[PDB]
Design an enzyme around this catalytic site. Structure first.
Site, PDB file in Angstrom:
ATOM      1  N   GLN A 166     103.334   0.010  28.494  1.00 23.25           N
ATOM      2  CA  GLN A 166     104.407   0.759  27.846  1.00 23.25           C
ATOM      3  C   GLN A 166     105.716   0.420  28.542  1.00 23.25           C
ATOM      4  OE1 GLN A 166     103.631   5.000  27.420  1.00 23.25           O
ATOM      5  NE2 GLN A 166     105.810   5.391  27.041  1.00 23.25           N
TER       6      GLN A 166
HETATM    7  N1  LIG Z   1      91.660  -5.771  15.804  1.00 26.18           N
HETATM    8  C1  LIG Z   1      91.612  -5.762  17.132  1.00 26.18           C
HETATM    9  N2  LIG Z   1      92.039  -4.648  17.828  1.00 26.18           N
HETATM   10  C2  LIG Z   1      91.994  -4.636  19.185  1.00 26.18           C
HETATM   11  C3  LIG Z   1      91.521  -5.733  19.895  1.00 26.18           C
HETATM   12  N3  LIG Z   1      91.585  -5.440  21.208  1.00 26.18           N
HETATM   13  C4  LIG Z   1      92.088  -4.193  21.349  1.00 26.18           C
HETATM   14  N4  LIG Z   1      92.341  -3.687  20.101  1.00 26.18           N
HETATM   15  C5  LIG Z   1      92.895  -2.367  19.772  1.00 26.18           C
HETATM   16  O1  LIG Z   1      94.285  -2.308  20.049  1.00 26.18           O
HETATM   17  C6  LIG Z   1      94.639  -1.004  20.479  1.00 26.18           C
HETATM   18  C7  LIG Z   1      95.258  -1.076  21.876  1.00 26.18           C
HETATM   19  O2  LIG Z   1      94.330  -1.614  22.803  1.00 26.18           O
HETATM   20  P1  LIG Z   1      94.472  -1.298  24.373  1.00 26.18           P
HETATM   21  O3  LIG Z   1      93.273  -1.824  25.134  1.00 26.18           O
HETATM   22  O4  LIG Z   1      94.690   0.183  24.614  1.00 26.18           O
HETATM   23  O5  LIG Z   1      95.778  -2.149  24.756  1.00 26.18           O
HETATM   24  P2  LIG Z   1      96.516  -1.969  26.168  1.00 26.18           P
HETATM   25  O6  LIG Z   1      97.326  -3.215  26.453  1.00 26.18           O
HETATM   26  O7  LIG Z   1      95.529  -1.665  27.273  1.00 26.18           O
HETATM   27  O8  LIG Z   1      97.508  -0.729  25.880  1.00 26.18           O
HETATM   28  P3  LIG Z   1      98.377  -0.079  27.074  1.00 26.18           P
HETATM   29  O9  LIG Z   1      97.494   0.855  27.857  1.00 26.18           O
HETATM   30  O10 LIG Z   1      99.546   0.672  26.480  1.00 26.18           O
HETATM   31  O11 LIG Z   1      98.898  -1.170  27.980  1.00 26.18           O
HETATM   32  C8  LIG Z   1      93.354  -0.185  20.496  1.00 26.18           C
HETATM   33  O12 LIG Z   1      93.217   0.530  19.273  1.00 26.18           O
HETATM   34  C9  LIG Z   1      92.267  -1.244  20.588  1.00 26.18           C
HETATM   35  O13 LIG Z   1      91.051  -0.799  20.048  1.00 26.18           O
HETATM   36  C10 LIG Z   1      91.086  -6.857  19.201  1.00 26.18           C
HETATM   37  O14 LIG Z   1      90.664  -7.837  19.815  1.00 26.18           O
HETATM   38  N5  LIG Z   1      91.137  -6.864  17.820  1.00 26.18           N
END
Ligand SMILES: Nc1nc2c(ncn2[C@@H]2O[C@H](COP(=O)(O)OP(=O)(O)OP(=O)(O)O)[C@@H](O)[C@H]2O)c(=O)[nH]1
Ligand SMILES: [Mg+2]
Lengths: 189, 114
Positions: free
Chosen positions: A69
């Protein structure tokens, strides 16, 4: 001081620390959750950071996943110290933020505490039809112009866990090679 | 050398219980920022680094109440090199393990609640 010096003059050969960064919503936390094969539904955006200590090919991988974020990015640097490998995660379908993803990655690479790290780029969400190809993402981010670090781009889908391991295997091998190389020049000169 | 003497005092300073009081008084200031969840807060880190500085500093002070001419860097340099280690360094390493530091804090919080 004594305490922190002690720590590194004591880490065991096969403990590696990996820092996973990237824009919010890239899928950082989904990715490391999948590594253990923990369920990945009910994952919420990270306000702080997750630490998951792994096990792969005789290595103990201590992986730090820090919230991407925007209002949190200034604190990323409190996690730079002792990073053997940097994992930059990219939402391949997030076409409108490719520039900021680029800006963010670039500033990390001139960072002194990250001088040694191997760089692994996960072009995540390849399961989405709007997902840009790895090449397109390599073009943006202008990865070809990085000579300061070893890097590779691995297209993947954290949601299905496809191609995460090959990314990690490249990263471990590169990390091993660097250490191997350093040891070589140390004992000879 | 003068080394084996300092190694002896470390055991005496940290396994003393003025140290354990130091730790408690530190935690008293932050213990309720600590939540029992797997996700850590960014604020745990500056607190963690504050803790490390505090321990490191309590050490050097106590060590020169012993040897009034004790130079931390000299001992650290001589250690970070050619007298390379033991059994108490293992407890010294403890202070830099973030996960155990967090658990130290979590057990304390539950204790304070009541
Ligand atoms: N379609 C799709 N969605 C994904 C994939 N990987 C993660 N997501 C989705 O994207 C959204 C965000 O994923 P996160 O793992 O929370 O991403 P993050 O970078 O850790 O987010 P922050 O904690 O804010 O940094 C979630 O709804 C996941 O389920 C993917 O490979 N394909
Ligand atoms: Mg997350």
């Amino acid at each position: 001081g004594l305490l922190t010096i002690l720590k590194k003059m004591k880490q065991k050969e096969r403990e590696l620390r990996l820092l996973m960064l990237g824009l919010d919503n890239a899928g950082k936390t989904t990715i490391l959750k999948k590594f253990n094969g923990e369920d990945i539904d009910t994952i919420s955006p990270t306000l702080g950071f997750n630490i998951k200590t792994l096990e792969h090919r005789g290595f103990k991988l201590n992986i730090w996943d820090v919230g991407g974020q925007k209002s949190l990015r200034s604190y990323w640097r409190n996690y730079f110290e002792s990073t053997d490998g940097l994992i930059w995660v990219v939402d391949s379908a997030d076409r409108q933020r490719m520039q900021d993803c680029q800006r963010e990655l670039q500033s990390l690479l001139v960072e002194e505490r990250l001088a040694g790290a191997t760089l692994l780029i996960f072009a995540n969400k390849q399961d989405l039809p709007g997902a840009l190809s790895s090449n397109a993402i390599r073009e943006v981010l202008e990865l070809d112009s990085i000579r300061s670090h070893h890097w590779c781009i691995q297209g993947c889908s954290a949601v299905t866990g496809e191609n995460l391991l090959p990314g990690i295997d490249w990263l471990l091998d590169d990390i091993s090679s660097r250490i191997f190389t350093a040891d070589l020049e140390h004992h000879h000169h | 050398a003068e080394f084996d003497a300092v190694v002896g005092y470390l055991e005496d300073i940290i396994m003393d219980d003025e140290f354990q009081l130091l730790q408690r008084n530190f935690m008293d200031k932050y213990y309720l920022e600590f939540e029992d969840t797997e996700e850590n807060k960014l604020i745990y880190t500056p607190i963690f680094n504050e803790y490390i500085s505090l321990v490191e500093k309590y050490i050097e002070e106590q060590l020169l109440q012993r040897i009034p001419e004790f130079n931390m860097a000299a001992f650290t340099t001589t250690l970070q090199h050619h007298k390379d280690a033991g059994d108490i360094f293992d407890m010294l390493l403890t202070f830099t393990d973030f996960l155990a530091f967090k658990e130290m804090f979590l057990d304390y919080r539950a204790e304070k609640e009541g």
